[PDB]
Amino acid sequence: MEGFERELDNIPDTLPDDERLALWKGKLKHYLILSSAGKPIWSRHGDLSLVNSTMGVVQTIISFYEGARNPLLGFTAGKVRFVILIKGPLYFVAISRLRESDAQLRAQLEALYMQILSTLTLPILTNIFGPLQGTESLLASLADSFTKGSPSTLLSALECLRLRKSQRQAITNIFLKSRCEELLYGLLVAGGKLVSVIRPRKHSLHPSDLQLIFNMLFESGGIKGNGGENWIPLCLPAFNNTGYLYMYVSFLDDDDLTALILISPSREAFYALQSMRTRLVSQLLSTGYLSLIRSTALSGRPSITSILPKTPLLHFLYKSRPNVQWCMSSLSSLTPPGATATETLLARRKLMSVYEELHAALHARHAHLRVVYSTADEKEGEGLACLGWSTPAFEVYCVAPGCVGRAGMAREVNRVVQWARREEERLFILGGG
Amino acid sequence: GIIPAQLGFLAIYNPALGTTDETLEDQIVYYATASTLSQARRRHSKEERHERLRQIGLAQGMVEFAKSFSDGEPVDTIDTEKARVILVEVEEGWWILASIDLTRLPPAYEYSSREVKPPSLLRADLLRAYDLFLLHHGSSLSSLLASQGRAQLVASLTRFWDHFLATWNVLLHGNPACDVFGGIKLAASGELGIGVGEEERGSGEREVLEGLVERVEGLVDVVVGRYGGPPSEKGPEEEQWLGLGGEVGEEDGAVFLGVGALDRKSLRGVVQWMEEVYVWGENAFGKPRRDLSTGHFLLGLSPKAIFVERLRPVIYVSQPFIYILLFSEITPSPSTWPTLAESLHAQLSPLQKPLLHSTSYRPQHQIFDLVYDTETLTLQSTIPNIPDPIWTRVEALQTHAQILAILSSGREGERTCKTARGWWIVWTRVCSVLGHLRSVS
């Protein structure tokens, strides 16, 4: 809320442990990993020395409940909320001080669990129970996004970049003619936004599988701190209880960066995949699509005023229940004069903190809300009031200025869906090839 | 084979009661179980003790754990899959712990909470019963311990709490929207016409009431309420007006909220206890038994008391308009009781027929509002209650679940909702007035 700008910074680890715990004590968000025996495995904002002393209570709490045949589900206390997730020997617990519902933390903790499973397959995941040798930085940076707001994981979808149907189709075709017999499925991404998908006839790309690839590469790891071509193993929930599936990641360069994802089920396919990229870059440069991709990726997040003329809506957000994807509008439109990183960070966090209550309101326990309206009118700052709307077929979010009312949103919400419906082919992928 | 969501165990403990292991066993003051409810339900082992004391041990651990994160002292709700556990601080160190066993639905073995009473109002319900309990024993529960001693509290606490939990249906029954707030129920007429100089309807009848507290000796305040209808002259003679059932919204609201000498905080209690005699006829704490000499009377000075800092109550009963005549501690002499009973039946005789039509006064397809005022605690209500097994039973489960779901979120400020079958719930705040412009179709 107020201390968020200094919240994202890590523990200094240069001051006595007394107030060190106090610094960890009041931070907004906390994600923890503790084993069934109660030993804490991973703590994001805290060192393992800090967590174990304080977190022994949770193990004590669950120990009684597991004995009473009651796997505990979650707490709540005033502003802060405690959520417990059970997945195998590992126990997932998250502490949230923001106005986040338990369902939001369940999704956020679920993504963290998927990362552990993606590196260690299910048969070895149970038997092995540090254990997370290379996923420490992967998990630490992933929790940074959740604190920053994560419009993707909170909504459980993927972004898209604005390319026309014909242009997108041409990329898919040139991504399919250059095919080898070891592409279980491959992806092309630019700046975190999916570009094209290639699929075989029988094997299916479960939308839950995509979130594994995007979260560990384009949101948390930054393609493992660049480094060039990387060949790393992978595990997918669809292809569970199998050996580590193999995925190829490399920058497609001669944000602005564009990366290429190819996946093979065999160890000795790296050279074929490496040769696959080499022939791909030549054809993309020959046609000029790669030069087009960087321009569109750089000028992403279209301005809402350009999308809709003379519209006071500060922001937009859209989703499609079938063919799970996700759209968005401009984000740097909060204040053009603002240039320092501190106001644009709070601009984002508050912006998703406007939607953090709305998503909880729509998704309740068999409450079946359809349209939700509110008003977070500041005492002196401004009359910033939120909006909201929904459908079993799609979801829409909105934010409006001090000029408010049902007509303050229905005058536009009924046509922002039409704009998304009009621009659905150039903003959402129905399927691969 | 659906198992209803019956109450599990409910405990009353003071963490500061025992600072040693030998004294830690006695932290529990009142304990309840499904087996314990069985003995009282029909009216309306060492290892077992180990589990009782052990489970509250986590609660003191839980409150201490979360107290240090957000400065928010209580872990109000503990969420599990079998038993929804709530925790409420009633008064400065006394805690009530309840465990609502979920709706067991053996899918060979499944759980649900589609109709389980949400924890947003049990805190209001438990505080209601606790405040209702404090209306019968002492001013404050903490001061009650210092007077009667630890041993005496358990007997009195068991006597009342075993009665309440014997029929505390943990389900969406009655009017949850009104139950979330404390509030004072106001009838269709609501508060009577104030002032002298206009006739209108139900205006000059306050002067006789406001004059009643003057002529009769030692009367501090009275309250009335149209729980029942006019005297039914149908086949059956009595209609058994006091008996099983539930209070009806927009009809049961108390009227003539008071005159003075009663704080608005403790004026809620007397109305709530006055609600009990109608809802639980002849079966309330104190066991009101109607007098055969004067049929239109109940209780009567002749032990029972009400603690508002100590008014001895008497109950004057017409078929509508339950009268709660609060008499002082000493000034009414119990020896001259029969003379006052005849005068009271005569003084309040001409306030039956004129008052009946007066309270019958009333002030986008269908609209139901609800006004709650913070400083005066009045609850002008219109939302209908769930009918027993204007809507159907199944619909109002969702409507009353969503109405109080958004109340917990908020606490301009305007909010709005909708549902597939068609509703429009609007919570608006402006004196702070909470208007609930709940619409439908």
Side-chain angles (χ1 to χ4, degrees), chain B residues 198 291 298 301 310 352 379 418 422 432:
Chain B
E198 95 275 8
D291 192 1
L298 178 48
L301 303 160
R310 292 288 297 164
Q352 166 62 29
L379 189 70
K418 185 178 184 293
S432 291

Side-chain angles (χ1 to χ4, degrees), chain B residues 33-44 162 166:
Chain B
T33 44
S35 74
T36 309
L37 178 136
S38 79
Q39 289 89 11
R41 199 55 208 94
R42 67 187 182 179
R43 188 163 294 103
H44 308 75
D162 190 85

